């Protein structure tokens, strides 16, 4: 169901075989450099949400290789790492040894996706930086013309990330708001009170 | 103003739009200038050559081994060949590497190397490519490839204990030109790392004072190990080469 779709969640504990399956999946982990440890990021069952798709995955400092690590022991192997290039309204660019003037997204593949559009677009953004940890809205565009249509899931997403087509799942939406007849038989089914616990 | 959109409708990258891509920088580049050795270079078959042979032990070491990928439209290397490379050998214990590690498997493969190597990454040093010059030229995607690949990486592994952005903007270089901005030796020089400085794989067009290049389509040598560390004996052993030259 195409409208935006969320569920404040422990992403830790939610059940997320309730979920069905996915084209795209977002992520963008509060690493451990309310965080995860390392361990609770691998134990995620994120070799569930898809069969052939792509996965995009913010990473910084140690997560660049922690995130890697992540993409592989889920069944990913990365193929191809978008950079943000950070910029002021004036198109402007905004680790101890330089300053950072951009942030990664790692692409991972799971399976053999057919039908996606590789390479309209290129693998740099160039976008105004927003409030602190704010991805660039743009991801969604080419995410989009990669996959119309689709279904797509972001984990640790916050209220200004739900899109038609996602379901966004984090711990500081409002609720829960499923629209997705499937979604909605398998939640109700397998949380009957509405709560999510362990 | 959505400039992926735009790349999309039009084939300007979003780097395009870049602008501008105290100011006392100067005076620290003209201490380097002065501390620099002169400049010294070996013709050598790396594959083939003893790499302990370079001595003494360096405080930074530029790697730029030639990827199949670097040449679309055109001796490769393979992850396989660089990975065994025995770069500890030659790394002082406290030192420094960059490796250019292009835009697809070897920005994994170039990690497992700095691990390999006894590195770890502490910055990750991205080339973007401009197209300002030719917005309609295609680009002939990997299979593997998501997006269009318009940019490099070169990545800084430290060992031991112990102005800049990390990102170079410059246009696409013609095809069959496999060259690296020469930005990234200012942003390794402004380090202040010490003053052995080896670049595997340069070529007689990278030369440079204050390194020492080595590769195997140099046409000439001046390489002299003993000569060599005749410029780092005492009182120059610990210099930042930022600093001035000893009375
Ligand atoms: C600039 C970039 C492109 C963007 C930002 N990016 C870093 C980044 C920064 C902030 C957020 C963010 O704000 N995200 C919304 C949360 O809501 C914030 C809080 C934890 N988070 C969770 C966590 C979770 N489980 C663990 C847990 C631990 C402790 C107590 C808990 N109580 C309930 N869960 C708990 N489950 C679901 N969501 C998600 C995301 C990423 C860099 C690049």
Same mark, same amino acid.
């Given at each position: /169901? #195409?409208?935006?779709?969320?569920?404040?969640?422990?992403?830790?504990?939610?059940? @997320?075989?309730?979920?069905?399956?996915?084209?795209?999946?977002?992520?963008?982990?509060?690493?451990?450099?309310?965080?995860?440890?390392?361990?609770?990021?691998?134990?995620?069952?994120?070799?569930? %949400? *898809?069969?052939?798709?792509? /996965? #995009?995955?913010?990473?910084?400092?140690?997560?660049?290789? /922690?995130?890697?690590?992540?993409?592989?022991?889920?069944?990913?192997?990365? @193929?191809?790492?978008?950079?943000?290039?950070?910029?002021?309204?004036?198109?402007?660019?905004?680790?101890?040894? %330089?300053?950072?003037?951009?942030? &990664?997204?790692?692409?991972?593949?799971?399976?053999?996706?057919?039908?996606?559009?590789?390479?309209?677009?290129?693998?740099?953004?160039?976008?105004?930086?927003?409030?602190?940890?704010?991805?660039?809205?743009?991801?969604?565009?080419?995410?989009?013309?990669?996959?119309?249509?689709?279904?797509?899931?972001?984990?640790?997403?916050?209220?200004?990330?739900?899109?038609?087509?996602?379901?966004?799942?984090?711990?500081?939406?409002?609720?829960?708001?499923?629209? =997705?007849?499937?979604?909605?038989?398998? #939640?109700?089914?397998?949380?009957?009170?509405?709560?999510?616990?362990? | 103003?959505?400039?992926? *959109?735009?790349?999309?409708?039009?084939?300007?990258?979003?780097?395009?739009?870049?602008?501008?891509?105290?100011? +006392?920088?100067?005076?620290?580049?003209?201490?380097?200038?002065?501390?620099?050795?002169?400049?010294?270079?070996?013709?050598?078959?790396?594959?083939? #050559?003893?790499?302990?042979?370079?001595?003494? !032990?360096?405080?930074?070491?530029?790697?730029?081994?030639?990827?199949?990928?670097?040449?679309?439209?055109?001796?490769?290397?393979?992850?396989?060949?660089?990975?065994? $490379?025995?770069?500890?050998?030659?790394?002082?214990?406290?030192?420094?590497?960059? $490796?250019?590690?292009?835009?697809?498997?070897?920005?994994?493969?170039?990690?497992?190397?700095?691990?390999?190597?006894?590195?770890?990454?502490?910055?990750?040093?991205?080339?973007?490519?401009?197209?300002?010059?030719?917005?309609?030229?295609?680009?002939?995607? =990997?299979?593997?490839?998501?997006?269009?690949?318009?940019?490099? &990486?070169?990545?800084?592994?430290? !060992?031991?204990?112990?102005?800049?952005?990390? /990102?170079?903007?410059?246009?696409?270089?013609?095809?069959?030109?496999?060259? !690296?901005?020469?930005?990234?030796?200012?942003?390794?020089?402004?380090?202040? +790392?010490?003053?052995?400085?080896? &670049?595997?794989?340069?070529? =007689?067009?990278?030369?440079?004072?204050?390194?020492?290049?080595?590769?195997?389509?140099?046409?000439?040598?001046?390489?002299?190990?003993?000569?060599?560390?005749?410029?780092?004996?005492?009182?120059?052993?610990?210099?930042?080469?930022?600093?001035?030259?000893?009375?």
């Amino acid at each position: /169901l #195409f409208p935006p779709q969320w569920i404040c969640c422990d992403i830790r504990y939610l059940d @997320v075989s309730i979920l069905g399956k996915f084209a795209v999946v977002m992520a963008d982990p509060p690493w451990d450099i309310g965080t995860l440890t390392d361990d609770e990021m691998r134990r995620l069952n994120i070799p569930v %949400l *898809q069969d052939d798709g792509f /996965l #995009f995955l913010w990473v910084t400092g140690r997560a660049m290789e /922690l995130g890697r690590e992540c993409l592989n022991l889920w069944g990913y192997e990365r @193929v191809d790492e978008i950079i943000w290039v950070k910029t002021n309204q004036l198109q402007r660019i905004i680790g101890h040894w %330089l300053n950072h003037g951009k942030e &990664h997204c790692l692409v991972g593949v799971k399976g053999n996706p057919q039908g996606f559009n590789q390479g309209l677009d290129c693998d740099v953004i160039v976008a105004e930086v927003r409030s602190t940890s704010h991805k660039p809205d743009e991801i969604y565009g080419m995410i989009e013309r990669l996959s119309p249509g689709t279904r797509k899931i972001e984990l640790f997403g916050r209220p200004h990330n739900v899109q038609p087509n996602w379901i966004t799942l984090g711990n500081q939406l409002d609720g829960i708001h499923l629209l =997705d007849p499937d979604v909605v038989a398998r #939640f109700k089914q397998r949380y009957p009170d509405g709560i999510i616990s362990k | 103003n959505d400039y992926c *959109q735009h790349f999309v409708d039009t084939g300007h990258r979003p780097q395009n739009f870049i602008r501008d891509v105290r100011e +006392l920088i100067r005076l620290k580049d003209e201490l380097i200038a002065k501390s620099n050795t002169p400049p010294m270079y070996l013709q050598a078959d790396i594959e083939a #050559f003893d790499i302990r042979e370079l001595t003494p !032990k360096f405080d930074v070491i530029l790697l730029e081994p030639p990827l199949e990928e670097y040449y679309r439209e055109t001796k490769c290397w393979t992850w396989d060949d660089i990975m065994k $490379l025995e770069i500890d050998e030659i790394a002082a214990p406290r030192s420094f590497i960059f $490796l250019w590690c292009g835009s697809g498997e070897g920005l994994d493969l170039g990690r497992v190397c700095l691990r390999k190597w006894g590195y770890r990454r502490c910055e990750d040093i991205c080339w973007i490519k401009t197209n300002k010059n030719n917005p309609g030229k295609t680009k002939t995607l =990997d299979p593997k490839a998501v997006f269009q690949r318009t940019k490099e &990486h070169c990545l800084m592994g430290i !060992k031991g204990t112990v102005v800049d952005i990390d /990102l170079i903007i410059t246009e696409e270089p013609e095809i069959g030109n496999i060259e !690296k901005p020469v930005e990234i030796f200012h942003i390794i020089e402004h380090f202040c +790392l010490g003053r052995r400085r080896l &670049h595997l794989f340069g070529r =007689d067009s990278t030369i440079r004072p204050g390194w020492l290049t080595v590769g195997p389509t140099l046409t000439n040598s001046n390489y002299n190990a003993e000569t060599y560390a005749s410029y780092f004996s005492a009182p120059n052993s610990y210099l930042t080469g930022c600093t001035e030259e000893i009375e």
